Paper text:
D,L-endopeptidase RipA is the major PG hydrolase required for daughter cell separation in Mycobacterium tuberculosis ( Mtb ), as RipA defects severely hinder cell division and increase antibiotic vulnerability. Despite extensive studies, the mechanisms governing Mtb RipA regulation remain controversial and poorly understood. Here, we report an integrative structural and functional analysis of the SteAB system, a regulatory complex that has been shown to modulate cell separation in the model organism Corynebacterium glutamicum ( Cglu ) and is conserved across Mycobacteriales .
Numbering used by the authors:
A (entry chain A): 47 to 142, 152 to 170, 174 to 199, 203 to 219, 223 to 314
B (entry chain C): 41 to 139, 150 to 313
Write the structure that this text describes.
């Protein structure tokens, strides 16, 4: 059994490298004009992978778009042991109840352009500085964006999934499209992609990709984000539970 | 005992996840194929030749991708077992003389190229329908080819010769005659590509024969993995590079491939 499983695995690893090579090489052709003139802000959870975010950022650029910022959500933010703390330092009511919704509404007004009063640079910088000072976020490097991708890791062991799904759902009405993307395993509870797909309201509001660890998933983030911005069309993609198909049907 | 069971579980988990990633890449490739080949063969016509070991699904995927690229397929011509066995050169010569003993593949490639391809040069004579039909019927009557459709096959700009995968060592005659056939078609149109299934990059298969010969490798493009979606799409992209850029390339995952697809 061990011999057959290792020979099968070794041959599959070789075959997958050729498949990944093809998809990386033709990626720019697949995403051509998908995000022309559009800006995207990326949010990442603590379990998100650098390589997944770098591949998504690169494909946004190949699609004619631009990334305004990468904002990291800290362990303190996702662990929801500070809803009262968040409101005490900065809340969405100061700009022109659960932690996820409140932070999504606040960061959405601050970083996304409503499809509403324009948020000036100083108000945005004050909001970002307050959240960083209190341990909620870190960020690189900030202008306003049209759309957003919230990137997570894969499976969660054990309400971190809920707070991130509610965070993404609260960002959605503040811009032209929100996509929640996770790695393989994110389509299983209690991860955020699974929470989103199991709730009729959230699944009709934001798109999801469950396999951002693979090249088809990284490309699909851009294609599905294009469908959100241009067509107002939501979709759930990948290889896990609740995925309607590996990628956009059109 | 527990370590052996843990090894089996971990190996099963790795193999299962790789199978899922590979099936997803094939499905992803099918869904985005039209985007990749968008406008690649606009206003161009392609004639397909197939050997007995070629697969219907590989040819249907190529024909479909040609159409998604804005092109059209004029005809599918089957080369028979008598053709690939390349032991009827004298008999073929007696047919070529009613349309030096030249090798069967080369003679047939030159004749079918004149009949089915439009020469890249405007001053070359146009082959009228009756001359084309007479040539096709003489080769069908003597057991060299069959073709679809039977009536009104038009002229094409480019060609794809489709084969199966690996050949046995004793089938060297079949690899050689098909590589020579494809090489002889090349000067008669705007581009010829020889595409085979996984294993075709190993000798004595036609793709392998082409890649190991300096002259043929410089004259026609090759794809060695037409059984996979990357290979089917690459046929159209590499055909585009031949017709529009005069650039030859050797693609796929086997010996002599410069890369999986065009750059």
């Amino acid at each position: 059994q061990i011999d057959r499983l290792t020979d099968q695995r070794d041959a599959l690893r070789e075959k997958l490298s050729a498949a990944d090579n093809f998809d990386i090489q033709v990626g720019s052709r697949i995403v051509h004009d998908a995000l022309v003139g559009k800006s995207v802000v990326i949010f990442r959870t603590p379990d998100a992978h650098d390589d997944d975010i770098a591949a998504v950022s690169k494909i946004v650029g190949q699609a004619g778009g631009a990334v305004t910022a990468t904002v990291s959500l800290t362990q303190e933010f996702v662990e929801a042991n500070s809803a009262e703390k968040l409101r005490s330092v900065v809340n969405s009511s100061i700009l022109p109840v659960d932690q996820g919704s409140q932070a999504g509404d606040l960061l959405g007004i601050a970083l996304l352009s409503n499809a509403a009063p324009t948020v000036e640079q100083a108000q945005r910088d004050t909001v970002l500085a307050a959240l960083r000072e209190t341990g909620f976020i870190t960020y690189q490097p900030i202008g306003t964006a049209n759309a957003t991708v919230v990137v997570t890791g894969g499976a969660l062991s054990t309400n971190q999934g809920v707070s991130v799904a509610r965070f993404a759902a609260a960002l959605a009405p503040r811009g032209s499209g929100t996509l929640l993307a996770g790695r393989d395993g994110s389509a299983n509870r209690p991860a955020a992609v699974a929470v989103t797909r199991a709730d009729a309201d959230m699944a009709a509001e934001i798109s999801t990709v469950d396999d951002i660890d693979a090249e088809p998933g990284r490309i699909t983030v851009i294609l599905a984000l294009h469908d959100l911005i241009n067509g107002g069309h939501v979709g759930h993609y990948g290889t896990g539970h609740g995925a309607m198909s590996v990628t956009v049907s059109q």
